[PDB]
């Protein structure tokens, strides 16, 4: 009745938690396309941004 | 020379930015025409599959909590019409103030006792999320059954399987190897 | 005095190289032995240099 | 050329990041696909073997403190039913306000006197820690027996 | 005046090189001399350069 409430522990300081990834580029350059906006479902292996390939082709 | 060719080709291929996870987009701080470097954040992807709860208990309650004990979690968006089941994953070896970058209290003022809180990891059942999904940062009332006490406070089992793995950023070197072969044949006479 | 806390050693984990993450082996509140891997990187560029 | 081969091989072998200490993982700010440099924090590992207490006594109590004096510590997670024994390690050479990550600026006119505090290190016994583990940041009530001043 | 405080000298010990620490020879509240080593690094890369 009362010690039953003692057999439990409560707290209202809880908050749901999850994972988050900050997408970052491996190279520098300028942006020419943006493939998604807020509240868009993207699958693994999908393109999210595209850069100008002018500077890389010269090195190639 | 071929090694440098491969490095240059990899540099060119990376001119597209690829998603390493399947989730939803939030905080899109990227517009066309911007100038970017690897340290500049573009956006965020938030997978909506594996979520847990962080319950902050006082030091008074942390005792008598072991790993694996049953839990019951109720949220506010869904009210009391939906319940959740979960388990204790473990308690943290720190109170948050351990890694803080600033003084807990002001130097000029006096010192006042404050009861500390210690986070606890609780894992939810995944068959309930798919039908009643959650979102990051929502408030919830947690209740842990502490009747049974084996005495397992600290985990001591290591696992050979990685938790989170992504291989969407791995580039296979077939076309580069074909191009190199063709160039060699061309310049060989 | 009641102004006494419990202090210990905590270690931050920092790479000696630069790369892109491909695996993670400890999530949180998990036991770790000395010498175990916690993170792995893509080995393409290092292999090319080799 | 062998030296350069060795440097490259060490570079490749270091793509796997190894833990230098036995302990437990606390914070995890690393996800698959993150771009990492040698200045980005990744995790934390907190062992549970050698733990001590840091008591902040007033300026007006550290007059008669000597190294090696007996001490008694009672945490709050357990209460008065469990008691820890220890001994003084050494008095710090500065006040918390002076050696804080943010300095205190006393020459400002709007200054109110406040009694200062000095950190003191206390050595806990490890044998009873296994029976009753303690976490970093918990709070305890300490007591130093200053009867002997030698 | 009552607004008086004691002050002294301090040293921010820093390394003349970069590396990874493999040993630490002192904790807080310990007595040190002028020649005593405090921290040790891994000498592999420097040995290669030598």
Curated annotation (Swiss-Prot), chain B:
One Gene Ontology term, aspect cellular component: efflux pump complex
Assigned protein family: Belongs to the membrane fusion protein (MFP) (TC 8.A.1) family.
Organism: Escherichia coli (strain K12)
Gene Ontology molecular functions: bile acid transmembrane transporter activity; identical protein binding; xenobiotic transmembrane transporter activity
Record text on subunit structure and interactions: Homodimer and homotrimer. Part of the tripartite efflux system EmrAB-TolC, which is composed of an inner membrane transporter, EmrB, a periplasmic membrane fusion protein, EmrA, and an outer membrane component, TolC. The complex forms a large protein conduit and can translocate molecules across both the inner and outer membranes. Interacts with EmrB. EmrAB complex forms a dimer in vitro.
Stated role: Part of the tripartite efflux system EmrAB-TolC, which confers resistance to antibiotics such as CCCP, FCCP, 2,4-dinitrophenol and nalidixic acid. EmrA is a drug-binding protein that provides a physical link between EmrB and TolC.
GO process terms (BP): bile acid and bile salt transport; response to antibiotic; response to steroid hormone; response to toxic substance; xenobiotic detoxification by transmembrane export across the cell outer membrane; xenobiotic detoxification by transmembrane export across the plasma membrane
Domain of life of the source: Bacteria
Keywords in alphabetical order: Antibiotic resistance, Cell inner membrane, Cell membrane, Coiled coil, Membrane, Transmembrane, Transmembrane helix, Transport
Name the record gives this protein: Multidrug export protein EmrA
Keyword Cell membrane in annotation: yes
Compartment(s): Cell inner membrane
């Amino acid at each position: 009745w009362f010690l039953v409430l003692r057999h439990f522990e409560e707290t209202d300081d809880a908050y749901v938690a999850g994972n988050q990834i900050q997408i970052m580029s491996q190279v520098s350059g300028s942006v020419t396309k943006v493939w998604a906006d807020n509240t868009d479902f993207v699958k693994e292996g999908d393109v999210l941004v595209t850069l100008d390939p002018t500077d890389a082709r010269q090195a190639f | 020379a071929a090694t440098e060719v491969r490095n240059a080709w990899l540099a060119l291929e990376r001119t597209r930015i690829i998603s390493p996870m399947t989730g939803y987009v939030s905080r899109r701080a990227v517009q066309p025409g911007a100038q970017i470097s690897p340290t500049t954040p573009l956006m965020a992807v938030v997978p909506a599959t594996n979520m847990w709860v962080d319950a902050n208990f006082k030091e008074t309650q942390i005792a008598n909590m072991r790993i694996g004990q049953p839990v019951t979690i109720t949220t506010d968006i869904y009210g009391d019409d939906v319940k959740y089941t979960g388990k204790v994953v473990g308690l943290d070896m720190g109170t948050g103030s351990a890694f803080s970058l600033l003084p807990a209290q002001n130097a000029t003022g006096n010192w006042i006792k404050v009861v500390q809180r210690l986070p606890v990891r609780i894992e939810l059942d995944q068959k309930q999320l798919e039908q009643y999904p959650l979102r990051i940062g929502l408030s919830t009332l947690v209740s842990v059954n502490t009747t049974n006490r084996d005495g397992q406070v600290l985990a001591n089992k290591v696992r050979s399987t990685p938790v989170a793995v992504s291989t969407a950023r791995e580039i296979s070197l077939a076309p580069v190897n074909k191009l190199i072969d063709d160039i060699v044949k061309a310049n060989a006479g």
